[PDB]
Design a protein around this nucleic acid. Sequence first.
RNA 1: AAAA
RNA 2: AAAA
Lengths: 375, 286, 230
Amino acid sequence: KIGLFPKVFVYKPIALAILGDKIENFSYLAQLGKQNCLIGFNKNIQGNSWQLAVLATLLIAYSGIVLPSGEIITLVHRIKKIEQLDAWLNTETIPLPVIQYQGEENELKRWQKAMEQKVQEKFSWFSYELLEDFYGITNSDLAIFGNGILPFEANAWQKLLQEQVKDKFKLLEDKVMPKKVLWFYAGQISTLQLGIGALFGFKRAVSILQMEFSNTTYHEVFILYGARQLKNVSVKKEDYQYIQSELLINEPHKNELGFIIYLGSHNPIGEAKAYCQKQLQINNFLIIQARENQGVMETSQNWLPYLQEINSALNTARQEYHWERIHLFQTAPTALCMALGIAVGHFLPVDVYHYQFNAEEPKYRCVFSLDKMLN
Amino acid sequence: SWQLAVLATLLVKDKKIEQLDAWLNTETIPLPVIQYEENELKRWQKAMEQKVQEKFSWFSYELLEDFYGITNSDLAIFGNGILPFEANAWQKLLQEQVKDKFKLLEDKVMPKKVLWFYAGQISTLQLGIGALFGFKRAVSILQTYHEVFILYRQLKNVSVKKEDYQYIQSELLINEPHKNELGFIIYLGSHNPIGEAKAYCQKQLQINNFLIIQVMETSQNWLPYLQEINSALNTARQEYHWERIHLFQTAPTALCMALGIAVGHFLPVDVYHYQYRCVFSLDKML
Amino acid sequence: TIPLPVIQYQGEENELKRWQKAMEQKVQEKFSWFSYELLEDFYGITNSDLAIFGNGILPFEANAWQKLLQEQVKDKFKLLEKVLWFYAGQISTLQLGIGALVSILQMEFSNTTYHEVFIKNELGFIIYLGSHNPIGEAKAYCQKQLQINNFLIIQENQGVMETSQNWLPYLQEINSALNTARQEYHWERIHLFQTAPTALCMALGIAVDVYHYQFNAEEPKYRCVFSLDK
RNA sequence: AAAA
RNA sequence: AAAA
């Protein structure tokens, strides 16, 4: 076995390490890693900093000094504990905390720190410095980041999806190639999440997180690991327990309907209906709201039923009808938008219209088309 | 004098010994902030210190300055004299201190979580300050000080239909269905602004679509008021389209702050401070 | 029982390699001695050979589907051939042609690994076992374009089919229904439309007009991409 | 609907 | 329906 440090060789409790000055027996190395080794060397290096590469190949480059307690003190050099390193090399799924943000870099750092704390809640071995050391993904790579407010131009939105989003997950999954990815995702702009999830696909295991702002701690609201129930359309309308779905058909001849989702608080139904009837000339609609608690969905409980019943309603509206085009206008949680984009995907002629707060009328605009994202 | 430092590294897990232990060991470090005579500022800050000591007896302003560098002026939205009605003064006041105060103060305390403790003075400006803060801040909004808004998602509940309204009564009046703008009189303060705001909308704005929401027990939690207000807003925004919203509201500073927290910058919203000027627009907050 | 994992993909080569690695792990937990380097070593069948591959998106022209089926697919399952095939593909409709020309797997995405789920005289054969109802679209296409009024609909747990067991009852029921319809009424040309998992589509092919639905296509979204009797 |  |  070979280990590189700013190299060491490890052979199969006497962890005798050879050196030009004086060979020493670091028996606590063998004790920490449960294997006796005869550490080799190629050149004389001052300072006992070659310990960490030895211990890591025992249990990329490493730097640090081990201690009998297992605490590490001083390319990977930002680790402290033995369990962090253990679950950093020997886990099966690498968490990849991805946050979409538009603003200034200080809030980006804060958001990433919060997301790192959430990942540490389930993977205490994780940290951003250790992630950037172990696999090279910095904070910017996991960030769908652009300075300031996105301009309300569909070209700008499509460009932002192209340069960053369209290949972000592919490149990050290619980076951590041998290990599976447990995508921890949060976002900022809700309509962007439909595109982010459509490019994400239903083929990726994901913990889609929403923050409980009462504690500034994220919550695993979409657990799709450990995902077929993601695409369950077996729910009938009479068996609806979370969503409330209506289907209006006033122009059966026209193969066009407006898909409007209201699961957040800020009601988009009036604005979207006016936009459809006044700019797109559409009278057919599929309207989804909440059943009992509109504007608040319990972040502690699993949010998968919401998307299940939404997708079931969407495909029940397609039972006896052909829709040449669907138009999506949503207010919804960021995680729910991402999950809905994951489930629906690119298979339907869906044009998603974003609502911009700082924009003149109309505040809706087809920023992207769900079927056109693969082009 | 070199004792406490060593004592500090004997209490880290990540006047009184309990104060140092909880300063080095807690996570939700409080920050009391007042929006605002400088002597009255000092008095209000001392009262805020006492109120936050009711829940965090280990926290002190001097301890805050020693540990994080946040001085009382850093927590103070200060400036001399009465507020001119001109919109430029209000916009500059938000842009100078209030725009990035939260960002800077959270940047100072980087590892630990943050529980804000907000107090304020001017009512219609509380919406701008809350929009600056946003719904993503674990904040206690206070009002002797009494904490009245405990936000540490229920603040954004719109499920409450018009029939089951416990506190407020909402009356959406539409006279021009083809016009996409709404007046947003909210009556929860002291004086009744209904007539003046109605005359202003029908005279200086040509608006006949108005929303009327209408002294309050400070001991109880103040969340159902905000819930029903947001519910009335989003029930109004259900079968109609609105492209401009204009507040003419009187209410406690706390509730206006929380309403700016909840509604935020999303809706096209221009608050007109009354002593009637668009001192800021919510969509222009960011 | 030599492993032979054949996968149909249409896109970038890196996602194809990722899919191939997942399929390799799926063979490995059933045949530990198998590997892709092993496949290219003992047999020489390299990863592109086991990949029914096309760069970008397959164009929505019939000549493209016939070229894909004849140039590669027709000679794929024959020339690559003891051996047992594990199949999972991208395009659901292309598995119908692939099957018409063994362990058929379907990917479970929570743990991100597959699971071996398989071990007038004109009518519209209809199957809806996915989570994207083609009944309205295919029925409208039949009524407006091909002038069809008779249908055979195949449809329980819809949108979730238990990918931890055998799907053989599904294919057996579909075969029984199709044969019963054939015995009852003679069908010179039976038109097949389906929204289904790729695995069950491949099995159904392994068991006569076929149409495909393209997401980035203009109306009509369905065309007769090939005939199952050709 | 710009961490709902 | 382009790993359902």
